[PDB]
Design an enzyme around this catalytic site. Structure first.
Site, PDB file in Angstrom:
ATOM      1  N   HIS A  43       2.124   9.091   1.047  1.00 37.98           N
ATOM      2  CA  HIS A  43       1.091   8.882   0.033  1.00 37.98           C
ATOM      3  C   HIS A  43       1.438   9.820  -1.101  1.00 37.98           C
ATOM      4  O   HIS A  43       1.880  10.943  -0.862  1.00 37.98           O
ATOM      5  CB  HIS A  43      -0.299   9.216   0.577  1.00 37.98           C
ATOM      6  CG  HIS A  43      -0.634   8.483   1.836  1.00 37.98           C
ATOM      7  ND1 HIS A  43      -1.392   7.330   1.853  1.00 37.98           N
ATOM      8  CD2 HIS A  43      -0.273   8.715   3.120  1.00 37.98           C
ATOM      9  CE1 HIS A  43      -1.495   6.894   3.099  1.00 37.98           C
ATOM     10  NE2 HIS A  43      -0.828   7.718   3.889  1.00 37.98           N
ATOM     11  N   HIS A  82       0.824  -1.221   0.000  1.00 38.86           N
ATOM     12  CA  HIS A  82       0.000   0.000   0.000  1.00 38.86           C
ATOM     13  C   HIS A  82       0.851   1.261   0.000  1.00 38.86           C
ATOM     14  O   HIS A  82       0.426   2.287  -0.526  1.00 38.86           O
ATOM     15  CB  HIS A  82      -0.957   0.030   1.206  1.00 38.86           C
ATOM     16  CG  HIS A  82      -1.818  -1.191   1.313  1.00 38.86           C
ATOM     17  ND1 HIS A  82      -2.819  -1.472   0.408  1.00 38.86           N
ATOM     18  CD2 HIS A  82      -1.820  -2.204   2.208  1.00 38.86           C
ATOM     19  CE1 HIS A  82      -3.403  -2.609   0.743  1.00 38.86           C
ATOM     20  NE2 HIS A  82      -2.815  -3.075   1.829  1.00 38.86           N
ATOM     21  N   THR A 142      -6.080   6.700   7.768  1.00 38.50           N
ATOM     22  CA  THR A 142      -6.590   6.978   6.427  1.00 38.50           C
ATOM     23  C   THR A 142      -6.622   5.742   5.538  1.00 38.50           C
ATOM     24  O   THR A 142      -6.982   5.839   4.358  1.00 38.50           O
ATOM     25  CB  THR A 142      -5.772   8.059   5.706  1.00 38.50           C
ATOM     26  OG1 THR A 142      -4.463   7.545   5.441  1.00 38.50           O
ATOM     27  CG2 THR A 142      -5.701   9.365   6.517  1.00 38.50           C
ATOM     28  N   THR A 143      -6.201   4.601   6.086  1.00 33.11           N
ATOM     29  CA  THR A 143      -6.351   3.307   5.411  1.00 33.11           C
ATOM     30  C   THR A 143      -7.115   2.378   6.344  1.00 33.11           C
ATOM     31  O   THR A 143      -7.104   2.569   7.559  1.00 33.11           O
ATOM     32  CB  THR A 143      -5.000   2.636   5.070  1.00 33.11           C
ATOM     33  OG1 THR A 143      -4.340   2.235   6.274  1.00 33.11           O
ATOM     34  CG2 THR A 143      -4.096   3.560   4.278  1.00 33.11           C
ATOM     35  N   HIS A 185       3.625  10.969   6.504  1.00 38.10           N
ATOM     36  CA  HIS A 185       2.998  10.681   7.782  1.00 38.10           C
ATOM     37  C   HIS A 185       3.996  10.052   8.725  1.00 38.10           C
ATOM     38  O   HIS A 185       4.462   8.939   8.487  1.00 38.10           O
ATOM     39  CB  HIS A 185       1.813   9.730   7.591  1.00 38.10           C
ATOM     40  CG  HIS A 185       0.658  10.378   6.902  1.00 38.10           C
ATOM     41  ND1 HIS A 185      -0.335   9.671   6.261  1.00 38.10           N
ATOM     42  CD2 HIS A 185       0.373  11.691   6.717  1.00 38.10           C
ATOM     43  CE1 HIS A 185      -1.202  10.521   5.734  1.00 38.10           C
ATOM     44  NE2 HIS A 185      -0.796  11.751   5.999  1.00 38.10           N
ATOM     45  N   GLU A 190      -3.258  13.528   0.944  1.00 38.49           N
ATOM     46  CA  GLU A 190      -4.514  13.072   1.522  1.00 38.49           C
ATOM     47  C   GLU A 190      -5.262  14.286   2.059  1.00 38.49           C
ATOM     48  O   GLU A 190      -6.378  14.577   1.636  1.00 38.49           O
ATOM     49  CB  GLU A 190      -4.220  12.029   2.597  1.00 38.49           C
ATOM     50  CG  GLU A 190      -3.540  10.809   2.012  1.00 38.49           C
ATOM     51  CD  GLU A 190      -3.856   9.558   2.771  1.00 38.49           C
ATOM     52  OE1 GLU A 190      -3.529   9.480   3.963  1.00 38.49           O
ATOM     53  OE2 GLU A 190      -4.431   8.640   2.160  1.00 38.49           O
ATOM     54  N   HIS A 245       5.691   6.921   6.557  1.00 41.29           N
ATOM     55  CA  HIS A 245       5.413   6.514   5.186  1.00 41.29           C
ATOM     56  C   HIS A 245       4.873   7.725   4.448  1.00 41.29           C
ATOM     57  O   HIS A 245       4.640   8.777   5.059  1.00 41.29           O
ATOM     58  CB  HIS A 245       4.374   5.391   5.157  1.00 41.29           C
ATOM     59  CG  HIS A 245       3.071   5.794   5.757  1.00 41.29           C
ATOM     60  ND1 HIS A 245       2.807   5.689   7.107  1.00 41.29           N
ATOM     61  CD2 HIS A 245       1.987   6.377   5.201  1.00 41.29           C
ATOM     62  CE1 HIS A 245       1.596   6.163   7.348  1.00 41.29           C
ATOM     63  NE2 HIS A 245       1.082   6.599   6.208  1.00 41.29           N
TER      64      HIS A 245
HETATM   65  N1  LIG Z   1      -2.095   6.902   6.831  1.00 38.50           N
HETATM   66  S1  LIG Z   1      -2.117   6.884   8.434  1.00 38.50           S
HETATM   67  O1  LIG Z   1      -3.384   7.325   8.943  1.00 38.50           O
HETATM   68  O2  LIG Z   1      -0.979   7.600   8.947  1.00 38.50           O
HETATM   69  C1  LIG Z   1      -1.957   5.335   8.965  1.00 38.50           C
HETATM   70  C2  LIG Z   1      -2.712   4.271   8.435  1.00 38.50           C
HETATM   71  C3  LIG Z   1      -2.566   2.952   8.885  1.00 38.50           C
HETATM   72  C4  LIG Z   1      -1.672   2.581   9.893  1.00 38.50           C
HETATM   73  N2  LIG Z   1      -1.513   1.295  10.313  1.00 38.50           N
HETATM   74  C5  LIG Z   1      -2.328   0.269  10.053  1.00 38.50           C
HETATM   75  C6  LIG Z   1      -1.715  -0.838  10.653  1.00 38.50           C
HETATM   76  C7  LIG Z   1      -2.202  -2.271  10.685  1.00 38.50           C
HETATM   77  N3  LIG Z   1      -2.139  -2.776  12.044  1.00 38.50           N
HETATM   78  C8  LIG Z   1      -3.151  -2.600  12.892  1.00 38.50           C
HETATM   79  S2  LIG Z   1      -4.366  -1.726  12.424  1.00 38.50           S
HETATM   80  N4  LIG Z   1      -3.109  -3.165  14.103  1.00 38.50           N
HETATM   81  C9  LIG Z   1      -4.198  -3.452  14.870  1.00 38.50           C
HETATM   82  C10 LIG Z   1      -4.056  -3.422  16.253  1.00 38.50           C
HETATM   83  C11 LIG Z   1      -5.141  -3.709  17.077  1.00 38.50           C
HETATM   84  C12 LIG Z   1      -6.385  -4.033  16.531  1.00 38.50           C
HETATM   85  C13 LIG Z   1      -7.510  -4.349  17.466  1.00 38.50           C
HETATM   86  C14 LIG Z   1      -7.513  -5.642  18.219  1.00 38.50           C
HETATM   87  C15 LIG Z   1      -6.473  -6.560  18.045  1.00 38.50           C
HETATM   88  C16 LIG Z   1      -6.473  -7.765  18.743  1.00 38.50           C
HETATM   89  C17 LIG Z   1      -7.518  -8.057  19.618  1.00 38.50           C
HETATM   90  O3  LIG Z   1      -7.521  -9.237  20.300  1.00 38.50           O
HETATM   91  C18 LIG Z   1      -8.560  -7.146  19.795  1.00 38.50           C
HETATM   92  C19 LIG Z   1      -8.563  -5.935  19.100  1.00 38.50           C
HETATM   93  O4  LIG Z   1      -9.610  -5.065  19.303  1.00 38.50           O
HETATM   94  C20 LIG Z   1      -9.708  -3.852  18.665  1.00 38.50           C
HETATM   95  C21 LIG Z   1     -10.787  -3.007  18.908  1.00 38.50           C
HETATM   96  C22 LIG Z   1     -10.869  -1.778  18.252  1.00 38.50           C
HETATM   97  O5  LIG Z   1     -11.838  -1.017  18.472  1.00 38.50           O
HETATM   98  C23 LIG Z   1      -9.876  -1.378  17.353  1.00 38.50           C
HETATM   99  C24 LIG Z   1      -8.776  -2.189  17.073  1.00 38.50           C
HETATM  100  C25 LIG Z   1      -8.653  -3.423  17.704  1.00 38.50           C
HETATM  101  C26 LIG Z   1      -6.537  -4.074  15.147  1.00 38.50           C
HETATM  102  C27 LIG Z   1      -7.855  -4.423  14.513  1.00 38.50           C
HETATM  103  O6  LIG Z   1      -8.351  -5.554  14.714  1.00 38.50           O
HETATM  104  O7  LIG Z   1      -8.425  -3.574  13.792  1.00 38.50           O
HETATM  105  C28 LIG Z   1      -5.445  -3.787  14.324  1.00 38.50           C
HETATM  106  N5  LIG Z   1      -0.560  -0.434  11.229  1.00 38.50           N
HETATM  107  N6  LIG Z   1      -0.379   0.942  11.027  1.00 38.50           N
HETATM  108  C29 LIG Z   1      -0.920   3.653  10.400  1.00 38.50           C
HETATM  109  C30 LIG Z   1      -1.039   4.986   9.972  1.00 38.50           C
HETATM  110 ZN   LIG Z   2      -0.598   7.674   5.895  1.00 40.13          ZN
END
Ligand SMILES: NS(=O)(=O)c1ccc(-n2cc(CNC(=S)Nc3ccc(-c4c5ccc(=O)cc-5oc5cc(O)ccc45)c(C(=O)O)c3)nn2)cc1
Ligand SMILES: [Zn+2]
Length: 257
Positions: free
Chosen positions: A93, A61, A195-196, A116, A103, A91
């Site tokens: 965009h 991405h 934003t993703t 970002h 963005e 990173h």
């Molecule tokens: N362009 S930007 O805005 O700057 C941007 C965009 C994307 C990321 N990004 C995206 C990622 C992918 N990794 C993620 S999203 N990790 C993650 C961590 C925790 C959860 C999560 C849980 C993870 C494990 C669990 O047992 C329970 C959980 O319960 C939740 C509840 C919520 O309300 C929200 C998130 C979680 C989740 C997820 O599931 O979405 C994903 N890493 N960095 C960073 C920056």
């Molecule tokens: Zn970003």
């Protein structure tokens, strides 16, 4: 699954990620005349002197330059923030053409790209916990416009050939992210989201008013990256930006008059 194509792009994301139509989605247009100066906002404190970069990854991405976030080494404090936010990765965009790629927009103006710098609130212990909190992340956003080269960007540009395709990584130690900053730390700030996908509403956005300049050759090299994996049909990694989302019940605050 999700991406930036006609069939999996931003208009489709809501089907798998209903928060896409939420109350605090990012990015947004920054209407400079409506943003209000908030004299109570503190100067930003960007403390990157002890930063430890580790690796650069093409994740399909964008590409992430990743940092050691197991100690307070590169932190963001002050501004709208309460407490200490640790740098985990940066990173960009960017567009297929110089006239698009950012963005956030400023009075509807799109920049060629947007950097970002992603930080998580220490109080929550790690990034995964932090994204579950409305004040879990602080993302420092910096616009890029095409003009003179950014010398501090060249080390990133030159490694990109080694991470052309999705899933490729390379060692990327001793990179100083201070070389990516503009002179001024004047900013706008508002509560928003990733934003993703998963589009989690966990981000305090801090968007710098002053863009950095990068050269046409530098951005052209961003555009040689691939969304696809090795041995797959080549799809250039370009236009990996989400468009502006409705501001809804939010105010954008300015650190400056
Ligand atoms: N362009 S930007 O805005 O700057 C941007 C965009 C994307 C990321 N990004 C995206 C990622 C992918 N990794 C993620 S999203 N990790 C993650 C961590 C925790 C959860 C999560 C849980 C993870 C494990 C669990 O047992 C329970 C959980 O319960 C939740 C509840 C919520 O309300 C929200 C998130 C979680 C989740 C997820 O599931 O979405 C994903 N890493 N960095 C960073 C920056
Ligand atoms: Zn970003």
């Amino acid at each position: 699954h999700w991406g930036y194509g006609k069939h999996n792009g931003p208009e489709h994301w809501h089907k798998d990620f209903p928060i896409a139509k939420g109350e605090r989605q990012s990015p947004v247009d920054i209407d400079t005349h409506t943003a209000k100066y908030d004299p109570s906002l503190k100067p930003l404190s960007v403390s990157y002197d002890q930063a430890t970069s580790l690796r650069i990854l093409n994740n399909g991405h964008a590409f992430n330059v990743e940092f050691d976030d197991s100690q307070d080494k590169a932190v963001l404090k002050g501004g709208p923030l309460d407490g200490t936010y640790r740098l985990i990765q940066f990173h960009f965009h960017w567009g297929s053409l110089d006239g698009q790629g950012s963005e956030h927009t400023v009075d509807k103006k799109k920049y060629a790209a947007e950097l970002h710098l992603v930080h998580w609130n220490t109080k929550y212990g790690d990034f995964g916990k932090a994204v579950q909190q409305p004040d879990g992340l602080a993302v420092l956003g910096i616009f890029l416009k095409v003009g003179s080269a950014k010398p501090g960007l060249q080390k990133v540009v030159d490694v990109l050939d080694s991470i052309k395709t999705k899933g490729k990584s390379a060692d990327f130690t001793n990179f100083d992210p201070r070389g990516l900053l503009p002179e001024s730390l004047d900013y706008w700030t508002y509560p928003g989201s990733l934003t993703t996908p998963p589009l989690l509403e966990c981000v305090t956005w801090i968007v710098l008013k002053e863009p950095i300049s990068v050269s046409s050759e530098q951005v052209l090299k961003f555009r040689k990256l691939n969304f696809n994996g090795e041995g797959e049909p080549e799809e250039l990694m370009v236009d990996n930006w989400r468009p502006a989302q409705p501001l809804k019940n939010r105010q954008i605050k300015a650190s400056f008059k």
